[PDB]
Amino acid sequence: DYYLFLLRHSSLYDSFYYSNYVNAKLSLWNENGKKRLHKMFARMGIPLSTAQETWLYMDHSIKRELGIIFDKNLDRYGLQDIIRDGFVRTLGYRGSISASEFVEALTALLEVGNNSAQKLTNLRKRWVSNFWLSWDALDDRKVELLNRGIQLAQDLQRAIFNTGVAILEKKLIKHLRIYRLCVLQDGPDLDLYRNPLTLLRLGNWLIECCAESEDKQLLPMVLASIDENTDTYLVAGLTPRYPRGLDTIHTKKPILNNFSMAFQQITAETDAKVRIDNFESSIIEIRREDLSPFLEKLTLSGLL
Amino acid sequence: ELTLESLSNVKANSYSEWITQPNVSRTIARELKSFLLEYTDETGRSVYGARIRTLGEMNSESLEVNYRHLAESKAILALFLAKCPEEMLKIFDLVAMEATELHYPDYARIHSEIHVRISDFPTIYSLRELRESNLSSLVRVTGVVTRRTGVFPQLKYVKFNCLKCGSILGPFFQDSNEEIRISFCTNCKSKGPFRVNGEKTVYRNYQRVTLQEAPGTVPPGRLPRHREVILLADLVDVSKPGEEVEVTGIYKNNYDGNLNAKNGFPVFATIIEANSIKRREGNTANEGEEGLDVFSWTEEEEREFRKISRDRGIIDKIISSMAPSIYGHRDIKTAVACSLFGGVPKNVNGKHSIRGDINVLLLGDPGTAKSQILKYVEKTAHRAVFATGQGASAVGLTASVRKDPITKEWTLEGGALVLADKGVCLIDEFDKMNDQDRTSIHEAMEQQSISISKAGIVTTLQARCSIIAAANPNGGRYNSTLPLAQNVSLTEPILSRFDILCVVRDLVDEEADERLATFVVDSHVRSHPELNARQRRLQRQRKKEEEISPIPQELLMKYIHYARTKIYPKLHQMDMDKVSRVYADLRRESISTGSFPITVRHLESILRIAESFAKMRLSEFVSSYDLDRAIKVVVDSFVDAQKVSVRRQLRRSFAIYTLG
DNA sequence: TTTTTTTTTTTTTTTTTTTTTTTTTT
DNA sequence: AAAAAAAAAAAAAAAAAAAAAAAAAA
Numbered sequence A: 001d002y003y004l005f006l007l008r009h010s011s012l013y014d015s016f017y018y019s020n021y022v023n024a025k026l027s028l029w030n031e032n033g034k035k036r037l038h039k040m041f042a043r044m045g046i047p048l049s050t051a052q053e054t055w056l057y058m059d060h061s062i063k064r065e066l067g068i069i070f071d072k073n074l075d076r077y078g079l080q081d082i083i084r085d086g087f088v089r090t091l092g093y094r095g096s097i098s099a100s101e102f103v104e105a106l107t108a109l110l111e112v113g114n115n116s117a118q119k120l121t122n123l124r125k126r127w128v129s130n131f132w133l134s135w136d137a138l139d140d141r142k143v144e145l146l147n148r149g150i151q152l153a154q155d156l157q158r159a160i161f162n163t164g165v166a167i168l169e170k171k172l173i174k175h176l177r178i179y180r181l182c183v184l185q186d187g188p189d190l191d192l193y194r195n196p197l198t199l200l201r202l203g204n205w206l207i208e209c210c211a212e213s214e215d216k217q218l219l220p221m222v223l224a225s226i227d228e229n230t231d232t233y234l235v236a237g238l239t240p241r242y243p244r245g246l247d248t249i250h251t252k253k254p255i256l257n258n259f260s261m262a263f264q265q266i267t268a269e270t271d272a273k274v275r276i277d278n279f280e281s282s283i284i285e286i287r288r289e290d291l292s293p294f295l296e297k298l299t300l301s302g303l304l
Numbered sequence B: 001e002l003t004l005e006s007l008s009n010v011k012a013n014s015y016s017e018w019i020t021q022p023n024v025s026r027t028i029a030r031e032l033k034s035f036l037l038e039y040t041d042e043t044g045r046s047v048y049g050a051r052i053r054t055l056g057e058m059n060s061e062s063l064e065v066n067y068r069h070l071a072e073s074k075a076i077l078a079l080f081l082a083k084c085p086e087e088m089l090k091i092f093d094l095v096a097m098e099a100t101e102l103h104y105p106d107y108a109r110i111h112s113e114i115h116v117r118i119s120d121f122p123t124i125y126s127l128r129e130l131r132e133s134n135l136s137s138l139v140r141v142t143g144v145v146t147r148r149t150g151v152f153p154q155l156k157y158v159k160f161n162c163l164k165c166g167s168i169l170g171p172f173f174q175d176s177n178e179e180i181r182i183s184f185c186t187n188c189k190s191k192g193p194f195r196v197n198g199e200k201t202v203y204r205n206y207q208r209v210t211l212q213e214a215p216g217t218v219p220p221g222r223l224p225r226h227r228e229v230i231l232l233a234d235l236v237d238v239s240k241p242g243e244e245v246e247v248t249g250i251y252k253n254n255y256d257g258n259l260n261a262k263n264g265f266p267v268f269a270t271i272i273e274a275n276s277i278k279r280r281e282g283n284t285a286n287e288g289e290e291g292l293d294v295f296s297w298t299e300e301e302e303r304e305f306r307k308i309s310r311d312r313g314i315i316d317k318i319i320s321s322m323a324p325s326i327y328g329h330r331d332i333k334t335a336v337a338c339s340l341f342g343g344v345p346k347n348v349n350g351k352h353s354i355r356g357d358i359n360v361l362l363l364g365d366p367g368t369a370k371s372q373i374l375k376y377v378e379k380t381a382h383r384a385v386f387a388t389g390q391g392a393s394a395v396g397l398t399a400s401v402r403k404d405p406i407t408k409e410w411t412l413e414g415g416a417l418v419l420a421d422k423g424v425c426l427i428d429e430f431d432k433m434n435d436q437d438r439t440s441i442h443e444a445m446e447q448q449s450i451s452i453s454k455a456g457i458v459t460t461l462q463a464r465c466s467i468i469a470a471a472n473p474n475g476g477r478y479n480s481t482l483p484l485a486q487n488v489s490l491t492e493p494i495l496s497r498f499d500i501l502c503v504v505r506d507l508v509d510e511e512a513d514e515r516l517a518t519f520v521v522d523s524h525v526r527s528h529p530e531l532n533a534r535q536r537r538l539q540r541q542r543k544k545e546e547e548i549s550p551i552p553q554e555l556l557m558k559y560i561h562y563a564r565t566k567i568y569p570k571l572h573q574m575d576m577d578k579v580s581r582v583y584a585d586l587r588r589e590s591i592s593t594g595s596f597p598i599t600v601r602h603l604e605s606i607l608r609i610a611e612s613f614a615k616m617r618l619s620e621f622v623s624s625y626d627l628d629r630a631i632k633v634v635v636d637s638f639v640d641a642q643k644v645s646v647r648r649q650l651r652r653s654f655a656i657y658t659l660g
Numbered sequence C: 001t002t003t004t005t006t007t008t009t010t011t012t013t014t015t016t017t018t019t020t021t022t023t024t025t026t
Numbered sequence D: 001a002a003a004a005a006a007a008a009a010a011a012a013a014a015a016a017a018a019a020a021a022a023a024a025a026a
Ligand SMILES: Nc1ncnc2c1ncn2[C@@H]1O[C@H](COP(=O)(O)OP(=O)(O)OP(=O)(O)O)[C@@H](O)[C@H]1O
Pocket: B325, B326, B327, B328, B365, B366, B367, B368, B369, B370, B371, B372, B373, B428, B429, B470, B516, B520
């Protein structure tokens, strides 16, 4: 299999387009990356019309020789790391599913499915409710729910890409000495980032984009998102990651997350209106008024 | 083997036989490949390598080769191509495909053959001056498309089968104008029934068109001449019925029984097989420039666009470069630039469509260079149509219904607004026009569509067009002591559809007159018509452009085309309260004292102008500067159309919004 | 004066059918 | 003497719909 997003349930062009690794290695958010991808597809010998067809209805001859075409061409563009081995499960005259696609469908089912304290309580209740929707999809009898999860995953990844290009083009990322800050205050569809998993998706997109950047640094990142209804920011701290294909000389116990201790230290000393109640200690909910001072304290906190 | 010196001497008393000899055709191919690989221009960059690189990216099937390049070096091959096109083109296509398979190996799975499109042939003929000496040679002819047959599949490798011997005949290349005639069998040794060998065959796209002579070329008062042109694959549907085109092709002859029967002499029919197509509809810049499309860009040109797009004050230079020889009238130039770049159309949930084009009106005194500005807009725009006054009708700016001469069914034909889809329609002397003809554009100005219900045809067309109109006030001159509604005859329904209105007044001022006269006299002095010399001409023509144009016009045309084609800015973060307050104030100050209709339709024009100013910078997001500039433009367009009594108060009242 | 009214002007043939009666052609 | 193929033979035309002029008037 390949490090491609939902290959067997979408086109080949879509799989190459919405991939974190390909986007990091080719910078598809601007025009140059799209032109480079078109040049690659032209060189490989696959017509642009054929690469946009559904996987089931794709040409048999092209599908048969995909491995050789990948092996002989992927090295020129630095994408030789997309080839790997995985696990594929098939049940009768139904169709093949890979483990990666299954976990993305499950995550999509988790994310979307189905006076401020009550507002937060209803959101948490819906998040609890989504658990049974994800639970039902593990049974072989309920395949329509798995298909629904696949569609939801496609839509969610499209939204993440759309937000990420806006973040990257306007230079919203601010490089402080200790960490890198990104606060999303205005824009469309900020109601998708009230869920921690969607913000983790966007953070994984940004970290993947930064890891392959020629700039050599390992600073942690802070991602903040506003909810108008609750007037609260949801703030998450994300650890840096080494490049995927880098050697094992640096390999060790991975970089440690130090945001929990810093958040507890700042919360204890000052009477900030923060909520640290999630299982993940790196995700907090801070009132709108306290965001700008609190972060300043974090700048002097250290351990980051 | 032979040498380029040895191709000069000719044998067989015919050039075609000399070219088709096996030893000559091996030197020709090598020389053509060396020309393709090793040619460099003045700057030192190989152009055909870049063209081949772009070909695979775009999944193109054709290559464009300039005749001047192949004539400057290897002139013998240029002469051979000029005299004998058919045999040279077969070899040149093969060498082109071989050169293409050096950048994109395995490209044969996309396209199996590469076609070559010749450009900039030196000699241009008219249809009236074609004679028999031009038979079987490459020619360049201008004309006007009249009628188009439509696309049908045509056989490429024709096969035959004979039953009594069961023989299958080898593939035959069809002439595309003469039916393949076979009567002898290699095996049957006698006449036998021949089948078409059903299935297992290769087809091509075929189309036919008729070119009349252009009215400008035809001598005044004489009948035009027409000819037939065959368009093969990759060239179908490029030309449209009504456009004016230039075709490079091969002039051929064929035997027709009816022509011999009627005339009474053994005369032959002629037809042109098209090789290259260039559009000339609205183009007056055909005097210079090289290529098949002057609105297309290369990679280095796109890089230069992105380089000059990040300079501060690009909008100011773009505005200053509009109609450079006209002095003053900067608001008109700003409106023209905003209309040229345009806005962004929108569709909300697939049920609510919002227009994204800016319309401009110019109402002014005589002798203020409005028509010259319209002509400049016609020249710069990619697609432009021109009309004036009583010379246009209700169905001449719209779709008409005609009986097809062949099919004999009622059919729809195009018009001025349809010929300028995604373009500009210019209407000079817009007030000296019938009301029935003027009211035909009401649907196209806002809904951007045309609906016809005539003679059993019930259809809706699409006209995404922008209108820049010029008019004269009542009495020929503007009374500044009167409101707008009494200086024009147009009513509210047509005045609301315009985005920007420019009132041009001529006033007595000694210093202004002196400056205008000095500028005009200097312009007349400049325009007086009295290494390689052909590049000395270019450098001298650039020196004159240096003074009054911050950027060259040829660069600006491609800049505008690229900006319109690629960029689509959005409005994520912006100040809603300022726009709401401005709209409410404008609505209040209209009924109280004013005669300029303001509705919800004028709220969206500010956003459209903001998106246009964002496009000017090649940015994907609208900033605060662009929105403020749009608000300032809209406010200045409203204040200066008032009476002299209340203008000073209105300007002061509206001055808080435009602080910058 | 800008409205309504008015004549009027090409628009047409591209197709059909099985006999019946002729010339070539083994 | 007996087959297979190949043309002649058309005729017809009024009746309606759409678009641009060159004379009439509130
Ligand atoms: N700054 C200028 N202002 C006005 N006219 C200018 C200027 N510079 C040059 N001219 C010349 O003055 C002449 C008058 O221009 P033009 O014919 O366009 O006037 P107009 O009254 O707007 O025309 P029309 O009635 O055809 O719309 C033109 O020959 C034009 O080139």
